[PDB]
Amino acid sequence: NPFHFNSKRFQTLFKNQYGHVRVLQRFNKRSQQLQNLRDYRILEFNSKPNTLLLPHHADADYLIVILNGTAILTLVNNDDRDSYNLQSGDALRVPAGTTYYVVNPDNDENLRMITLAIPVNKPGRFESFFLSSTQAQQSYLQGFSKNILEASYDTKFEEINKVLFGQESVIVEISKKQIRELSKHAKSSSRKTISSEDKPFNLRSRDPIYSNKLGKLFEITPEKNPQLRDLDVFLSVVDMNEGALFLPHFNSKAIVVLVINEGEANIELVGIPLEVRKYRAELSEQDIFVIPAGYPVVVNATSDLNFFAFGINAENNQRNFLAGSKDNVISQIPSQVQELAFPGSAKDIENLIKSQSESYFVDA
Amino acid sequence: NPFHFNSKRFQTLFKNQYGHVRVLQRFNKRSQQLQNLRDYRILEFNSKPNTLLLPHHADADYLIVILNGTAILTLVNNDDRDSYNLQSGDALRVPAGTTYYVVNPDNDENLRMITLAIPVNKPGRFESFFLSSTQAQQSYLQGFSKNILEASYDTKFEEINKVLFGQESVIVEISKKQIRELSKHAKSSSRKTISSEDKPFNLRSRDPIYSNKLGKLFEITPEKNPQLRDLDVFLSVVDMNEGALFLPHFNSKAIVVLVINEGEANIELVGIPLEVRKYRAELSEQDIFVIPAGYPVVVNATSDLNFFAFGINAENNQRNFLAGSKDNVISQIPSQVQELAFPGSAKDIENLIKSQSESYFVDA
Amino acid sequence: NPFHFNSKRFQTLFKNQYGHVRVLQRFNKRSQQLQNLRDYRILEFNSKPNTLLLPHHADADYLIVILNGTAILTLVNNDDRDSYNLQSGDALRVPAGTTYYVVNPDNDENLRMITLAIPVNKPGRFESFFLSSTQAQQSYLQGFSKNILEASYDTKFEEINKVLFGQESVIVEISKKQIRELSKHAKSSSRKTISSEDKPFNLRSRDPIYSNKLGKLFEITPEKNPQLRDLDVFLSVVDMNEGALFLPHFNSKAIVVLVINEGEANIELVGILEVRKYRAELSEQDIFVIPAGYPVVVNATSDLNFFAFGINAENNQRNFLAGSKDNVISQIPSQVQELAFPGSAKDIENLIKSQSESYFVDA
Ligand SMILES: [Mg+2]
Ligand SMILES: [Mg+2]
Ligand SMILES: [Mg+2]
Secondary structure, three states: OOOEEOHHHEEEEEEOOOEEEEEEOOOOOOOHHHHHHOOOEEEEEEEOOOEEEEEEEEOEEEEEEEEEOEEEEEEEOOOOEEEEEEEOOEEEEEOOOOEEEEEEOOOOOOEEEEEEEEEOOEOOEOOEEEOOOOOOOOOHHHHOOHHHHHHHHOOOHHHHHHHHHOOOOOEEEOOHHHHHHHOOOOEOOOHHHHHOOOOOEEOOOOOOOEEOOOEEEEEEOOOOOHHHHHHOEEEEEEEEOOOEEEEEEEEOOOEEEEEEEEOOEEEEEEEOOEOOEEEEEEEOOOOEEEEOOOOOEEEEEOOOEEEEEEEEOOOOOOEEEOOOOOOEHHHHOOHHHHHHHOOOOHHHHHHHHHHOOOOOEEEO | OOOEEOHHHEEEEEEOOOEEEEEEOOOOOOOHHHHHHOOOEEEEEEEOOOEEEEEEEEOEEEEEEEEEOEEEEEEEOOOOEEEEEEEOOEEEEEOOOOEEEEEEOOOOOOEEEEEEEEEOOEOOEOOEEEOOOOOOEOOHHHHOOHHHHHHHHOOOHHHHHHHHHOOOOOEEEOOHHHHHHHOOOOEOOOHHHHHOOOOOEEOOOOOOOEEEOOEEEEEEOOOOOHHHHHHOEEEEEEEEOOOEEEEEEEEOOOEEEEEEEEOOEEEEEEEOOEOOEEEEEEEOOOOEEEEOOOOOEEEEEOOOEEEEEEEEOOOOOOEEEOOOOOOEHHHHOOHHHHHHHOOOOHHHHHHHHHHOOOOOEEEO | OOOEEOHHHEEEEEEOOOEEEEEEOOOOOOOOOOHHHOOOEEEEEEEOOOEEEEEEEEOEEEEEEEEEOEEEEEEEOOOOEEEEEEEOOEEEEEOOOOEEEEEEOOOOOOEEEEEEEEEOOEOOEOOEEEOOOOOOEOOHHHHOOHHHHHHHHOOOHHHHHHHHHOOOOOEEEOOHHHHHHOOOOOEOOOHHHOOOOOOOEEOOOOOOOEEOOOEEEEEEOOOOOHHHHHHOEEEEEEEEOOOEEEEEEEEOOOEEEEEEEEOOEEEEEEEOOOOEEEEEEEOOOOEEEEOOOOOEEEEEOOOEEEEEEEEOOOOOOEEEOOOOOOEHHHHOOHHHHHHHOOOOHHHHHHHHHOOOOOOEEEO
16 A cells, blocks of 8 residues: 555654654655655654754745644744744745744644645755754754855854854753743734735634534635645645544545544545455554545544645645535436446436435544 | 557557547657657547447546547536537547546447546556446446445445446447437537637637648647646647648647548658758558657648647747748748858759748648 | 766867857766756857857757857747847847857957757757758758658759758858848847847846945846746856855755856855765866755855856745845844854854855955
8 A cells, every 4th residue: 555654654854852853755765656746745843842943944845734732933034034823723835945943832732743845956855954053963054164164254263163063953942931032023824814925824714615513624725825826735624523434535636645633544545347446544643645636535533533634736626526415426427327327227326326415524 | 760659559448339448658658759748648539429438537637629520528527517519620628537428429420539638646647437337347436345335325235236336348329319318508619719718619710820722720729728728738630632741840849749530641750970860650540640849840641631739838839841932931041141051052042942832731 | 076067077069160069968967966957958159250150940948148259149930030139148048949040240259158958858858950051960951851852842852952952060150241241130138128028138237136345246037037937047147356255155946057157266065964065176167056955155266257047046045154144144033043053142143243244255
């Protein structure tokens, strides 16, 4: 099952008592069945309360989404700064080469961020450039020679090397006094920022797309947001009670990357007398699962479930269901055609299709 | 000759007394000389009078063109239906993930369709998802487990399997009564739909680009059509009497994919003391020939010829001729430069270039 | 150092007493670290005064820049001609499949053209199609058969072969009389064509971006020019006095291709737990690639002049790590600076403020 990505598929970049930064292996590492995802990578960050991820930039375009907790994300530009107070469901597009740092200002909640990255110099391959100098990594400033550094900073190398080069890793503890000072002018999201070119936006800013007693699905697309339109990506989040089933359906043109935030679930995927291929998998918290465009899929929540999804090639994507009383494509095919396509009669076919009176999310 | 594609290069996907679905091999299969066409595939469909292509969707963007006959192409959306009555020269873009079926409503004419496909999940590799259940293929619904299907459809698996799972292939016969019932409300093209975002358009909707006693060429480009602009593709159709010659010319930036509909022709292609490379081939009905951008080419009709062409990387493409009285690039080169580029004198060069008083199509 | 391209990396296509056409090898030939430049190729042209580059077209989109001298670039369309008088710093985008010829109208100056090419049929691979017939190459017209050519031109093959098929190479001498007649209606650039859809534009048409006693940098981006916008490319030219240093900085998202026009320089680049230190000494005509986000510094060993093609340019930012202007480090709060660097907040500020100059400083 090349579409299932569990912990063995992630790679740790930085880890200590305060935080864990890791990246998913290249989507096309194992199988070449996901070739059109070669330009993308998934980054995962988790940190304890009152912590700071040191300043750095990446040679990759970034789309950040907060799964759990609160974060003060501060973009450090060459002539100014932009800080944002981001909470669960907030997303922010950070251009490649933008220096930034992240603070978890909460006193009790851990922070969990997921980042969709799009490398610039090589397809799906990139590096993180930390300005800081720790035991886990040397500052990129150390790449320059002594004579160069002396001329640039116009000071003796013994001083530069003492002040700059001379912490355990890239995630460090920060005082409540410093957190309070670093959170002063942080801007947050609002229903107005839904269509902003630079400000953060929440995935639950509007009414959910699907919503009943068993589940809810919220979504932000390239249609309302300029940031997402340029990346041609949609973002969605789903909540399902234990025992609920996300009815059979397929995405018309979007390649969907699933990230399990909370809970467990069984997922069935269908690929292609010509036989169909049955891909099966049991998903756990933090697992990743890829749904190729056009492939029918089903998600069954084993416990209270919450997952997020990044939709690549998103523009005008359509969700077509094969069961249920709403958005059921089969119920749109005329009886004359249904009768020729299936063995049963036009009557048996319609009676069957009407059996399930609920839609989207049903009892498993 | 890596640019010539005869019948041995097509792959049969489905075939019986009523129809034949075939797909051309990957363009860069044999030679890596067509590397920039690896994202595209050509699909061919031919069916007898009064038949139906069963409902399915593809994980690939589709641009459909009718070469012969009539078709009732019905797009089945999750909330509704859209059916079109298409005749020769009509084209329609069908987005990936769109379920549809095709009917040949005519009583005597065979339908012939050509589709330019653009796979979503893998470069130039895709699959067809048929909802139907026949001897040639199982429904993709059979990919889900019994328990899942029971909960989804709220019915015992014995009923589902009986009505939905339980025809010889994907092409079947259809009564005239049913054809009549499925042909109601079908919308057709007209001079106005040339610039429609979703309606079909005819390649001969307007005056031909080139036209004389020996030939005609019609063309629709991204400049007037939004569907074509989004794909950055142009469509053209050519008619040439037996013994006519399509004068030497090259496409400035478009990579042109030719498909012979009727007739036969000899084609010469020129690639690159540095010597030129001569590519020769004799074309027959249904053959395909690729003309890389910038490569001089000539088409000589051995018999009454009719062919269609899909032009990739089409925006602002230009046809530059090297002979004839119209659009001859050589006649635009100042005599001072002509004399320095060619061994002959300025007078000898001007006299030679002027001998051919006809343009575009001349006697072979 | 896979980022350095010296004379050994170029390929001669045509050469004689009057001119020299060469093309840089595929960027991803030696290494795979430059995979996202695989669709690009750099073409170089140098010619003597009073010379003509014979008419031809290429199956590649072109972005032409004049580094030295003057040129009459004439685009020959199927229905007419477009002529342009190009001088130093002038640029013009020429669509794939456009026939054209180049004249060096000057009586004393050598012409130097650099061309960024984007091949159409194959990533980074293409060919030049010359109409001319010389000892170095046959006309692409010879690719057709006698019977086709006879029907096409409506003339016996003996005449066609005599008049067209039958000069040593594709660069030839041309009289001053012919040059004056061939320059009759050439349009030139001006501050008014900086953002032109079809006309040539000059890199120094407006005030430089950075400018002090030691150096200068001019730049034209997709934001102002439509031709550059469609290619998502920016063009810049730099002038540095001997002993000057282009302060440490990095391009946020643009992959920059450097071309040395005059002078020499030492360049330091840093990649990525230890950092990788790429070093190189640059000479005239050398090429050097600077990946996006990679800190870099340029030290002029002698009076220096170089041009740069910036790929993936839209909204590119230049972030410096030293100096009194556009310094990213000076924008990092002291609470954070103090946590990322071992020195104290006071020691970090004093250090960052020591350099009162910006962009270009004393090496
Ligand atoms: Mg504390
Ligand atoms: Mg019948
Ligand atoms: Mg002379």
